[PDB]
Design a binder for this molecule. Sequence first.
Ligand SMILES: CCCC(C)(C)NC(=O)c1cc[nH]n1
Lengths: 300, 237
Amino acid sequence: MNTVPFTSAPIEVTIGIDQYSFNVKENQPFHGIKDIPIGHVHVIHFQHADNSSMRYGYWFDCRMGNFYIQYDPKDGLYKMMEERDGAKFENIVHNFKERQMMVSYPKIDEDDTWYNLTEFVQMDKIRKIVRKDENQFSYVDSSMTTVQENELSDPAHSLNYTVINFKSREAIRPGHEMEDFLDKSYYLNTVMLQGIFKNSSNYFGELQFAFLNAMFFGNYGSSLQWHAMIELICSSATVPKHMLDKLDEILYYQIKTLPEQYSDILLNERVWNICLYSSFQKNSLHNTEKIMENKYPELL
Amino acid sequence: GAMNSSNYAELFNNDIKLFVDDTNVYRVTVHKTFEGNVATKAINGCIFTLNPKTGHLFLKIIHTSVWAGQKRLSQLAKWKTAEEVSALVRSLPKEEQPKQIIVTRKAMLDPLEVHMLDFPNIAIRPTELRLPFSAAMSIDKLSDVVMKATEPQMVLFNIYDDWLDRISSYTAFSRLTLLLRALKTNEESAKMILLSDPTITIKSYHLWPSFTDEQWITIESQMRDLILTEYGRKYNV
Ligand SMILES: CCCC(C)(C)NC(=O)c1cc[nH]n1
């Protein structure tokens, strides 16, 4: 069990920790979150009660350091910081735990949701998408744009997702124009998997990270990336069987977790109808198709 | 973006552009088999690639051999079109290459865009105009060269004959669209109008008859009448 203590809670805020969220009143005696799953990345996120605009948060892995939250009244946000003094940190956390000033990450008999949503997500890969090398954790918010969105404006504050563009020289071999545009296997398997990602785990990790930033921060460029990565697989006629089976599980848990009331803005009708009903893989995503048809039949 | 009634004079400015029409690329006759099933037999086709300012027509003849052993021919035809247009552009000197290519059917946009990725500065555009370029195969000399081809071939024509010596390219394009619309709505009647008078001939190096200015006005009026008529004969009006 790891702990993310808070110095204090000076402004009223809805705090999220992975798929959980709870309200802390302005100046409430609240000192953080304990019992956090070692072995998982996590995301702690914030929506101020007074400005629902700008959801923001931090991706982190407690194995990489002792992290805490402290509100900054100048920049107006709850900031993650690393404490290098291990004994100081342990002492602080023990005091807050003894006085019962921390909420507990729940560990529920049946639950694998968070594992299933972050199975392939790695902190080291997050830190390459989100560039701020002096910190071990990564800040994301609603407004950050992706490298690809900037090509079509501050680079330091961008999401460096892998650029996917179906009408690009990278995607289309000279002389195989029709073949490569209608069957994207060479772009998936040779360019992206063998060439850029190295393996399917890294590809799925970025896909899952893009989904989670879309869902937790309403980050539009992340939603675009998630759908592009789904569409690149579904539009490939030749995909390893283990990748299709794993994609079906990945998407099943993402669709299961999505708030029912955000489906209209987080799900692209064209991509999903194409993927489930027109694409090469229309018959290879049984779990995803079943939950989509039972939970969002209107989109289809 | 799209080309329509509001930006019509853009066709006749000094930025090189080409229309591309693919409606005659894949052509079939549908017939019964001995067993009473239906089958198709391909016939030769053509890509209609036209500079509307100069009248230059790059007629790429599509011989039926290009379909042998291929599936999904209507889809392939769009990509073959895009392949041949891209090859044409690459064959032209840089200063002759188009700045825009306008496709007459939206289904050509992605095939052409993908084939032209090497030319990011050439704009690929659709149009909202309903242009009657399918009727190109009603021009006897164009139909003849297509049907006689035994191999892939490109033939260069000026679809305006010598009209630009006397009229502007706006007027020439308007004349061409009127003639082609008429041929499309009632080919027999339109051809009768064009060739009824044996004293007006077609020069060996031309496609249309050698009408005087006054005769063109009469001809053009007869084509309008034909189109309005058929529009009545059609809708009963
Ligand atoms: C008095 C100890 C119990 C605490 C106070 C830590 N619960 C919370 O702070 C809390 C706030 C919102 N949800 N839970």
